[PDB]
Chains A and B, each alone.
Chain A
Amino acid sequence: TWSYPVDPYWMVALKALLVVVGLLTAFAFMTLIERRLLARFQVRMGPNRVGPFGLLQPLADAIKSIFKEDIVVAQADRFLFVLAPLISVVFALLAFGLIPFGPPGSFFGYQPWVINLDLGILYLFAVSELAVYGIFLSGWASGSKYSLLGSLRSSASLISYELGLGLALLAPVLLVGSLNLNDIVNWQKEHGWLFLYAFPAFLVYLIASMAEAARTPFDLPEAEQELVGGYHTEYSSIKWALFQMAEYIHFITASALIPTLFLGGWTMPVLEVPYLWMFLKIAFFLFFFIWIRATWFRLRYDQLLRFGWGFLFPLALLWFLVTALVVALDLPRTYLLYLSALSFLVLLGAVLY
């Protein structure tokens, strides 16, 4: 944090609290929007009901969620059963503050972000491991091996693609040379839209984030119509809500980070407005991902693991090695533009056979 200021600690607590409650209301209204967008996808229309726009159905759902007989299952672990949702939610909420929503002071005085750590992507990676932690831990705590195998699927698949995330994220560091997202964003301001340089890595990051609970491995897994998933099947009132909430926060965190790093996390060449462009790109990634949600099938966690290991990780490490060649020899930056354009043309033109 060479060039970025520091708000007072009480302002840090205030901003963190506002971010948490914003994530709450946001994931609720985004559940509404996902329902209605799925509806538009499948002819059937959404809840023209309790709202008008349905925007009061989430409150009814939450009010039912409390008073919903939070039950302590017998034959189950007294402590971990209740404790795991706290992990899954807490270590999901965080890792969102780093994302820059504007230049300093564009928060009506103090700071668009919460924290601007020197080593950011490692923070995101570390707390990303803990979501899988909470998931499979809850899967175990139920004492139902039915859900246990689903929890194991969760951990196995998400961990494979979680490894792939590192080989994806290596490359842009060579260009930026710093591990703080804000320096990367200012770089994206100067040279412009980092993904133009590293589209393949972007893909292997994007696709990796598709495995991280967005959809299509979709062996996340959920109980529905298959070997039941973890983190559910025994929780009643709020803990189940806590798990769904944390998974959706992980979803929006990825859908915000992807524009942040590779594409233009805000930083717009046009109108350079602090918040609106970032929110719009987040919503765009949401529209595409929901398109995928209600448009693509599963990958069964077997073909998914084989695909992650044989395809994503070698490709990502190869791209890192190429970028390292260019950076270590440091003569051009244009060569990467040329090679990335060619790579994108390869991954695209190979389809229309």
Chain B
Amino acid sequence: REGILFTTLEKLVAWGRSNSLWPATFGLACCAIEMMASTDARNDLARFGSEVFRASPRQADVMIVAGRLSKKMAPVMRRVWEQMPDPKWVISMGACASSGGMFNNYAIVQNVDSVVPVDVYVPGCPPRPEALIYAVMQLQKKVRGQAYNERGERLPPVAAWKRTRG
């Protein structure tokens, strides 16, 4: 029941969800290859708990928006995001997803927070694979409830808990 209502139990389940981040592959653009390189045999996102990679949205919690989110893919991704279990986290990978990138035009959503609740933002073009590990570590200590912004605020464990989805 939501991972709450005991001081030890919420710490425990937050620990589990933090290190057991099961990525949901959503490769969009050239960010995708520097995403996969965070799993190659120089630098693997295969230690923290993300070795296995369930392409299914019904089985993976972290959605890595790796590339430009073109508008014709937005509504589809929409349902794909709703086709995730509720304990889900959404990372915005790359400049084109986090921001509009250099493609300031009619074609691209200029910030993916519009359609999906973003957990962590990561600048870069392409973000070095180790920066992707840094972003998942950021998300790690966020879902543990150990993350603070520049204004001093603690951030909720799971973004996408605060939106009247519909």
A/B contact in complex, CB under 8 angstroms? yes
Task: List the one stretch of A43-51, A169-177, A322-330 in contact with chain B.
Answer: A43-51
Q: Is B81 an interface residue (CB 8 A)?
A: no
Q: Is A68 an interface residue (CB 8 A)?
A: yes
Q: Which of B33-65 contact A (CB under 8 A)?
A: 39-41, 44, 46-49, 51-52, 55-56, 58-59, 61
Out of A48, A63, A224, name the residue touching B12 (CB < 8 Å): A63
Contact A232 B59 (CB under 8 A): yes
Q: Is A353 an interface residue (CB 8 A)?
A: no
Contact A240 B59 (CB under 8 A): yes
Q: How far is the CA of A62 from the CA of B49 in the complex (A)?
A: 12
* Interface of A, helix, strand, loop or mixed by DSSP: loop
Contact B46 A237 (CB under 8 A): no
Contact B55 A223 (CB under 8 A): yes
In whole Å, how far is B38's beta carbon from the nearest beta carbon of chain A?
11
Q: Is B85 an interface residue (CB 8 A)?
A: yes
Assess A233 versus B13: contact at CB under 8 Å? Given A60-B19, A67-B1: no
Q: How far is the CA of A237 from the CA of B20 in the complex (A)?
A: 13
Contact A49 B55 (CB under 8 A): no
* Interface of B, helix, strand, loop or mixed by DSSP: loop
Contact A224 B55 (CB under 8 A): yes
Contact A47 B51 (CB under 8 A): yes
In whole Å, how far is A233's beta carbon from the nearest beta carbon of chain B?
6
Q: Is B75 an interface residue (CB 8 A)?
A: no
Q: Which of A35-81 contact B (CB under 8 A)?
A: 35, 39, 42-50, 57, 59-64, 67-69, 71
Out of B13, B40, B44, B58, name the residue touching A63 (CB < 8 Å): B13
Q: Is the interface on chain A under 10, 10 to 19, 20 to 34, or 35 or more residues?
A: 20 to 34
A205-241 interface mask toward B, CB cutoff 8 Å, 1 = contact, 0 = none? 0000000000000000001110010001111110010
Contact B19 A50 (CB under 8 A): yes
In whole Å, how far is B77's beta carbon from the nearest beta carbon of chain A?
18
Which A residues are in CB contact (< 8 Å) with B41?
42-44
Contact A44 B44 (CB under 8 A): yes
Contact A64 B85 (CB under 8 A): no
Contact B58 A233 (CB under 8 A): yes
Which A residues are in CB contact (< 8 Å) with B15?
60, 63
Contact B49 A46 (CB under 8 A): no
Q: How far is the CA of A271 from the CA of B111 in the complex (A)?
A: 68
Which A residues are in CB contact (< 8 Å) with B2?
67
B77-92 interface mask toward A, CB cutoff 8 Å, 1 = contact, 0 = none? 0000000011100000
Contact A49 B87 (CB under 8 A): no
Q: How far is the CA of A237 from the CA of B85 in the complex (A)?
A: 8
Which A residues are in CB contact (< 8 Å) with B124?
none
Assess A67 versus B55: contact at CB under 8 Å? Given A42-B41, A60-B15: no
Out of B40, B51, B58, name the residue touching A46 (CB < 8 Å): B51
Which A residues are in CB contact (< 8 Å) with B48?
47, 49-50
Instruction: Closest B residue to A56 by CB, please name it.
Output: B19
Contact B49 A60 (CB under 8 A): yes
Which B residues are in CB contact (< 8 Å) with A225?
55
Q: How far is the CA of A324 from the CA of B86 in the complex (A)?
A: 60
Instruction: Closest B residue to A31 by CB, please name it.
Output: B52
Out of A45, A67, A228, name the residue touching B44 (CB < 8 Å): A45
Which A residues are in CB contact (< 8 Å) with B3?
67
Out of B12, B47, B59, name the residue touching A49 (CB < 8 Å): B47
Which B residues are in CB contact (< 8 Å) with A49?
19, 47-49
Which B residues are in CB contact (< 8 Å) with A62?
16
Which B residues are in CB contact (< 8 Å) with A60?
15-16, 19-20, 49
Contact B47 A47 (CB under 8 A): yes
Q: Is B22 an interface residue (CB 8 A)?
A: yes
Which B residues are in CB contact (< 8 Å) with A228?
56
Which A residues are in CB contact (< 8 Å) with B22?
64
Q: Is B17 an interface residue (CB 8 A)?
A: yes
Most central of A45, A50, A59, A67 by chain B CB within 10 Å = A67
Q: How far is the CA of A69 from the CA of B17 in the complex (A)?
A: 13
B1-38 interface mask toward A, CB cutoff 8 Å, 1 = contact, 0 = none? 11100000000110111011010000000000000000
Q: Which of B95-140 contact A (CB under 8 A)?
A: none
A236-250 interface mask toward B, CB cutoff 8 Å, 1 = contact, 0 = none? 110010000000000
- 10 closest Cβ pairs, A-B complex: A63-B16, A43-B41, A44-B41, A69-B85, A64-B20, A69-B86, A47-B47, A49-B47, A60-B16, A236-B85
Question: Could you show 10 A-B contacts with beta carbons less than 8 Å apart?
Answer: A35-B51, A39-B44, A47-B49, A49-B48, A50-B48, A61-B16, A61-B49, A63-B20, A233-B58, A240-B59
A44-B40, A235-B58, A236-B85 are known; give 17 further A-B pairs, CB within 8 A. A46-B51, A47-B48, A50-B49, A61-B20, A63-B16, A64-B22, A64-B87, A67-B87, A68-B85, A69-B86, A69-B87, A71-B85, A223-B56, A232-B58, A232-B59, A234-B58, A235-B59
